Subunit: 302 residues, 4 copies
């Protein structure tokens, strides 16, 4: 029937990306910047934050502040962020930053640092909250606001979007806005593709993200006990994709959070994966906007 | 008393299967095909899907679409399925496909591919949902429909059944239908056996399945952190059974899901287990319908 | 105040057990036999079983049968039990069986086998259910019944007790009954001790059990991914205790369940631990009734 | 806006601690002493304890005693505590004890032992309960009481505080009391810092604690399967911090609980980490009050 999902996509025939330097794989390291934008009555929310912290079994507290939860988030913005940024600078690997606009407003100096470092600032929404149930009017308003904030902060408007906890209208509103080159609000492929259902009809690129090669699993019910578990997980993902890349190259995202991989216990394994990746020839270490411009120039929208 | 369960089965005296090629073990690799058939208001369900995805702590959403959940499922049908099918083709190992009829209707080309590859299409029900509470009338109707769909799709009716989340009537309805050679809706033995309580009185073979040597544990609360955990789990299962097989051969199922082992990070470990298994002599790599026909010819129903 | 718990016990001065053969450690392997006695409307319960199976996130179903859950339990009594019993017979290690009386009634042949093998049959209660909220009258009645059943089944009354999910009266009722040598309904020490609060005033020995060196963790939210995790856990427990045993020997329990360690994937690691343990001199492999009689003869109740 | 959190802290410019012996890292091993102070109707609570035990999926029981839960806690005070104290004595490493005042009242002999051993007794609150919702009046009263108890018990008032499950007023009340040198009710940095918002205006030192390099994860939903997982986690944390310490030394806390790392299976890995740490030059093994006095003398409050 007139089924609004594409279960098929490229089928058994995915396109060759032709990554620069004849790369057998494209690696997109992504650093989320959410600290200061999460759930909090201080921010006008009805409850405290519970998602993604050391407090693995936390529940949101209605009309309350959860001090421990707040403090675990402050680790991300106070200490984790700088240690991570230094690590990427040390191996000369660029980042795409998934920056929440309210978080960035609260820490403009680190955002400025990131931009000066040459990292791409991608929009991660106005607030770090669940958009599942929000009215279309308000989600659109948050969106246009996130754009305003990041443009002023950065001096350049965001060209990609990623909400994460999206609702039924999130991605439609992104493509309707007009000014995005891409979005990342899918986990459906190993390659970019042109959105098949853009009402706008303009080319809109989808660059799928990840929930599995993602440090969020360090704090979820099912998830890595020690750093080496995340290293072996990342390593396996690389090995299979790199092997496929001998004839059919693909991409791999690596999701990271300041308050999570920022802890020394977890950073070690990220550095190990980076050294592993760097030891291979034909790896394209890149930003998602660069993948997007590359797609345009290589596989233009027909 | 007149207890409707058989807690005893074969007791301390299990039969020798006499697998072809004097195999010390029979390996049944199974690939579930559920993507497109899962919970969704689009499919007429009251809520979204929450079982078996990267969103380890998901809950069903009433009257809502969960876009992320949908997208994680689309990974299975868009990308995972082809990579898995290639892996099995590369080692010349046949599959039994646990194909959900609605999922197959949404992707007939992949089903046709599987059949052309020589994989057995086993019925996994009309829909991928919990049958626990469904009225007998409707479950029977789903069943006869699943049969209709797969016969047209495949050109041959399904000879095995597996629902998974069965209710008190599921298995009785399967045996009452008449045309199945076997079912897999048990986790009670290491060997096939004839159903002791078939009202039909015709021979009905039970080929027990698994929830432990099953990639579903990658996304459950208790479950594998990294691929090597699933490899060592599978390897241990093999080692003990193979050792028993010197005098008393048995079988082992390996359950797989497109949207799960389809991810590169997880495929590596499956390939490692396959290489391990292949390095042993006297291993029978087979389909469940072949086990069933073998049982008939070897241990006829008395 | 008049605090009904002993937080202190032996303090920094635990007694030397003087295990036979000058053992530096006493190992108590325990095999639970619960299959056939668990929650089930068939057994007169209000709901199905959910504790300790592959269905890691199961909930009890009110007025329903959970067929999968039943089938996972049937694995324990049909297949797991024999494989485990063979393993212990192969290394000549004796068991204490934690036998639920209703489970034993449903499978008398395996109970008879265990007794003929020389394993101790310890009482694990009439039913495998939570006694937390049961009235004293009914719990006492279950208890006297469990005794009746096992005596007839075995030809000798049970000399130890272990309920597991006890209520505020469980242990008091056990000691009031009179005929038990010991109970195991604590997790409070590394050595046996005489119950300090027996109203009876007769000597009653407490032999603490375990929830950590216990295969139940294979199916709990926090718990072993692969067999080697349970092997390394057991190995570490052994190493520290054995080292302490150079001057101050203690004991270690290893809890096992037919439907859990009975799976080949998990048995491998148990066999590895047994081989490790066996490779050490001065290890006392024993039954809990033997520890109890030893305590009597070695550290009589003053 | 006038946002009551400091998301920024030291920014990219953390101070050099100048640890004694030119240490590249400061290690604070912490032993919680909570057993006897946890939730219990015996203690006047409305429900039993459920946090941090082998009963990984426990829920609090209203108006009930949970005997197993109690017994698992008694392991901590009866057996775990002495084994842990011996381990630290063997490597000549000092502890900071996070002692709950009610727990200490129930076991004065072990507290006296700890003090005689030269370990610092830090206040962990009057009771081991959640202060999230307690009225300010009662939390203040608990606090002044915890102080009274520990001073009498120890012969010296506590100079640090740590509640853990704090409410919106906990830390403010601590600094208002006047007599504390520091608190540990944050998880926001890798270095001590002066509280920027002390109403008192006196210098108050914050020495951040941890929920990740903490044996509590052995019994949480996401957490270590085997001891080596905690060893590798601790080792990684050390390696990254020690490497940073070549130019910019920091500190690392290691949280421990008697009833958890007290089990032999878990102690092994703690001993392994201690041997690893000890094998490095320039490691400062210290107590938190010593870090605090050092901070005063080295980075006085301006």
């Amino acid at each position: 029937v007139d089924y609004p999902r594409d279960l098929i996509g490229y089928g058994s025939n995915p396109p060759h990306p032709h990554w620069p330097g004849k790369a057998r794989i494209a690696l997109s390291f992504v650093l989320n910047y959410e600290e200061g934008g999460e759930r909090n009555i201080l921010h006008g929310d009805k409850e405290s934050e519970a998602f993604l912290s050391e407090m693995v079994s936390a529940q949101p507290l209605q009309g309350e502040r959860n001090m421990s939860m707040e403090s675990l988030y402050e680790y991300g913005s106070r200490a984790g962020v700088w240690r991570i940024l230094k690590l990427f600078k040390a191996f000369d690997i660029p980042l795409t930053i998934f920056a929440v606009a309210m978080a960035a407003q609260r820490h403009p100096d680190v955002i400025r640092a990131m931009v000066a470092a040459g990292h791409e600032i991608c929009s991660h929404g106005y607030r770090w909250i669940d958009y599942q149930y929000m009215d279309e009017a308000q989600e659109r308003e948050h969106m246009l606001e996130a754009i305003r904030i990041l443009t002023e902060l950065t001096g350049e408007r965001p060209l990609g979007w990623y909400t994460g906890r999206t609702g039924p209208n999130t991605r439609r509103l992104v493509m309707e806005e007009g000014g995005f080159l891409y979005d990342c609000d899918t986990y459906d492929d190993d390659l970019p593709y042109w959105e098949p259902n853009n009402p706008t009809g303009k080319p809109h690129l989808v660059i799928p993200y990840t929930l599995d090669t993602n440090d969020m699993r360090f704090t979820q019910v099912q998830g890595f006990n020690k750093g080496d578990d995340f290293f072996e997980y990342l390593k396996d993902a690389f090995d299979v994709l790199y092997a496929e890349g001998a004839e059919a190259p693909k991409m791999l995202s690596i999701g990271l959070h300041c308050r999570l991989i920022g802890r020394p216990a977890r950073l070690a394994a990220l550095q190990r994966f980076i050294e592993y990746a760097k030891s291979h020839e034909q790896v394209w270490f890149t930003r998602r906007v660069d993948i997007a411009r590359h797609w345009h120039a290589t596989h233009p929208y027909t």
